[PDB]
Write a protein that holds these residues in place. Structure first.
Motif, PDB file in Angstrom:
ATOM      1  N   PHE A  63       0.782  -1.233  -0.124  1.00 38.63           N
ATOM      2  CA  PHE A  63       0.243  -0.097  -0.143  1.00 38.63           C
ATOM      3  C   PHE A  63       0.762   1.367   0.018  1.00 38.63           C
ATOM      4  N   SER A  64       1.812   1.215   0.945  1.00 34.78           N
ATOM      5  CA  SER A  64       2.718   2.494   1.147  1.00 34.78           C
ATOM      6  C   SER A  64       3.623   2.816  -0.170  1.00 34.78           C
ATOM      7  N   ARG A  65       3.952   1.551  -0.622  1.00 33.21           N
ATOM      8  CA  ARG A  65       5.101   1.761  -1.849  1.00 33.21           C
ATOM      9  C   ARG A  65       4.156   2.115  -3.038  1.00 33.21           C
ATOM     10  N   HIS A  66       2.925   1.774  -3.202  1.00 30.30           N
ATOM     11  CA  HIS A  66       2.249   2.446  -4.191  1.00 30.30           C
ATOM     12  C   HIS A  66       2.101   3.662  -4.307  1.00 30.30           C
ATOM     13  N   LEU A  67       1.704   4.270  -2.896  1.00 32.67           N
ATOM     14  CA  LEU A  67       1.470   5.796  -2.727  1.00 32.67           C
ATOM     15  C   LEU A  67       2.433   6.359  -3.001  1.00 32.67           C
ATOM     16  N   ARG A  68       3.821   6.158  -2.568  1.00 27.64           N
ATOM     17  CA  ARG A  68       4.924   6.777  -2.618  1.00 27.64           C
ATOM     18  C   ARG A  68       5.581   6.959  -4.073  1.00 27.64           C
ATOM     19  N   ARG A  69       5.380   6.127  -4.773  1.00 27.41           N
ATOM     20  CA  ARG A  69       5.941   5.950  -6.142  1.00 27.41           C
ATOM     21  C   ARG A  69       4.856   6.618  -7.171  1.00 27.41           C
ATOM     22  N   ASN A  70       3.933   6.882  -6.781  1.00 28.45           N
ATOM     23  CA  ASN A  70       2.765   7.885  -7.505  1.00 28.45           C
ATOM     24  C   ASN A  70       2.100   8.943  -6.606  1.00 28.45           C
ATOM     25  N   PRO A  71       2.618   9.676  -5.924  1.00 33.83           N
ATOM     26  CA  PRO A  71       2.184  10.399  -4.886  1.00 33.83           C
ATOM     27  C   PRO A  71       1.260  11.443  -5.480  1.00 33.83           C
ATOM     28  N   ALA A  72       1.462  12.034  -6.713  1.00 29.20           N
ATOM     29  CA  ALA A  72       0.687  13.154  -7.382  1.00 29.20           C
ATOM     30  C   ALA A  72      -0.859  12.487  -7.598  1.00 29.20           C
ATOM     31  N   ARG A  73      -0.746  11.314  -8.004  1.00 28.50           N
ATOM     32  CA  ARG A  73      -2.124  10.559  -8.060  1.00 28.50           C
ATOM     33  C   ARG A  73      -3.047  10.661  -7.019  1.00 28.50           C
ATOM     34  N   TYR A  74      -2.416  10.819  -5.831  1.00 27.34           N
ATOM     35  CA  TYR A  74      -3.111  10.884  -4.504  1.00 27.34           C
ATOM     36  C   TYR A  74      -3.075  12.413  -3.963  1.00 27.34           C
ATOM     37  N   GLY A  75      -2.420  13.135  -4.773  1.00 27.32           N
ATOM     38  CA  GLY A  75      -2.319  14.718  -4.201  1.00 27.32           C
ATOM     39  C   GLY A  75      -1.327  14.787  -3.076  1.00 27.32           C
ATOM     40  N   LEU A  76      -0.451  14.013  -2.879  1.00 29.89           N
ATOM     41  CA  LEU A  76       0.742  14.043  -2.158  1.00 29.89           C
ATOM     42  C   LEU A  76       1.820  14.787  -2.649  1.00 29.89           C
ATOM     43  N   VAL A  77       2.472  15.472  -2.066  1.00 27.32           N
ATOM     44  CA  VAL A  77       3.670  16.368  -2.345  1.00 27.32           C
ATOM     45  C   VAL A  77       4.839  16.011  -1.590  1.00 27.32           C
ATOM     46  N   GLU A  78       4.781  16.000  -0.181  1.00 30.92           N
ATOM     47  CA  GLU A  78       5.936  15.824   0.391  1.00 30.92           C
ATOM     48  C   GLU A  78       5.740  14.548   1.148  1.00 30.92           C
ATOM     49  N   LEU A  79       6.813  13.711   0.879  1.00 30.01           N
ATOM     50  CA  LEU A  79       6.815  12.155   1.383  1.00 30.01           C
ATOM     51  C   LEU A  79       7.735  12.207   2.773  1.00 30.01           C
ATOM     52  N   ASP A  80       8.785  13.120   3.007  1.00 28.93           N
ATOM     53  CA  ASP A  80       9.699  12.809   3.967  1.00 28.93           C
ATOM     54  C   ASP A  80       9.752  13.569   4.920  1.00 28.93           C
TER      55      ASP A  80
END
Ligand SMILES: CC(=O)SCC[N+](C)(C)C
Length: 287
Positions: A224-241
């Motif tokens: 689940f987290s690998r998919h989010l963090r590989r494709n963040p813009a799809r989910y509206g995420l910008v800052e992962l760290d």
């Protein structure tokens, strides 16, 4: 090809740690402070939403909403897989680890059977790792992972023994990207621990599911987290760290756009990530 969705869920009993807690650490630490328990601190603290260790509802709260279920959330921030907590000072008042949450749940049934339709949700093990790293545990990580696995299997077995039939067990999260682990230069240790738990635990749960005739679903939080963090813009995420709300070494003002952040503080995801996680967990079940 996907298999049939599982039957609907109307009641969840949740067991776990700060990734699930919806107010128990806050209630329990206020009780401990009132009693003058040595070393007690108010948890989670001031830069958190309504006693959650985040800026909003945890994944299991969103799961319950998605499924049309009532939630009894027994989870306590800091809970280890065994009897006790990251916060060693709690043990004098209450055993708040997964094993202690299961004991308290079975002891408070008040002459009622376990609800065989209720989903028993288990999400624990990060605190086993954080405690081992922060306080120099001597167990090799492979032995720590084996103890985590054994403790979770023992919890499912003891809940099933009492009458539970339905479970959802969450894998280790990706501890290797937690900001506090990155800052501690402990990425490889986290990778080794979480891989050991995630390879072994679903094997043990599959054997137990078959033996006891359980409905037991495994949620792979790492996939689940690998998919989010590989494709963040799809989910509206910008800052992962970067944490939206820094707390180490001291508290600093929160970021303006928290729904674009993965991490709330140095250990815990934001409400946005908890929302996506709870939607992903709900995907195995019919509404
Ligand atoms: C996953 C948990 O319960 S941890 C809460 C944060 N801590 C590691 C600093 C105690």
């Amino acid at each position: 090809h996907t298999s049939p969705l599982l039957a609907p869920v109307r009641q969840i009993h949740a067991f776990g740690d700060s990734y699930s807690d919806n107010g128990e650490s806050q209630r329990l630490t206020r009780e401990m402070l009132a009693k003058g328990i040595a070393g007690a601190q108010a948890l989670p603290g001031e830069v958190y939403w309504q006693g959650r260790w985040s800026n909003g509802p945890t994944a299991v709260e969103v799961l319950a909403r998605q499924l049309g279920a009532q939630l009894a959330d027994h989870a306590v921030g800091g809970a280890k897989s065994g009897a006790d907590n990251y916060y060693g000072w709690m043990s004098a008042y209450r055993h708040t680890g997964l094993a202690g949450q299961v004991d308290a749940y079975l002891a408070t049934l008040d002459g009622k059977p376990v609800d065989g339709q209720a989903l028993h949700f288990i999400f624990v093990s990060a605190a086993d790792f954080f405690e081992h790293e922060d306080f120099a545990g001597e167990q090799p990580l492979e032995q720590l992972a084996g103890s985590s696995v054994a403790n979770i299997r023992a919890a499912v077995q003891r809940l099933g023994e009492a009458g539970a039939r339905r479970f959802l067990v969450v894998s280790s999260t990706d501890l290797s990207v937690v900001p506090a682990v990155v800052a501690g230069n402990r990425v490889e240790r986290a990778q080794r621990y979480l891989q050991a738990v995630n390879a072994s635990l679903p094997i043990q749960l599959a054997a137990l599911r078959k033996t006891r005739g359980l409905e037991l679903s495994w949620f792979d939080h790492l996939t689940f987290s690998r998919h989010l963090r590989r494709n963040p813009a799809r989910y509206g995420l910008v800052e992962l760290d970067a944490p939206c709300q820094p707390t180490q070494p001291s508290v600093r003002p929160a970021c303006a756009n928290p729904d674009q952040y993965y991490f709330w503080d140095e250990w815990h995801p934001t409400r946005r990530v908890h929302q996506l996680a709870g939607e992903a967990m709900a995907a195995r079940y019919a509404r």
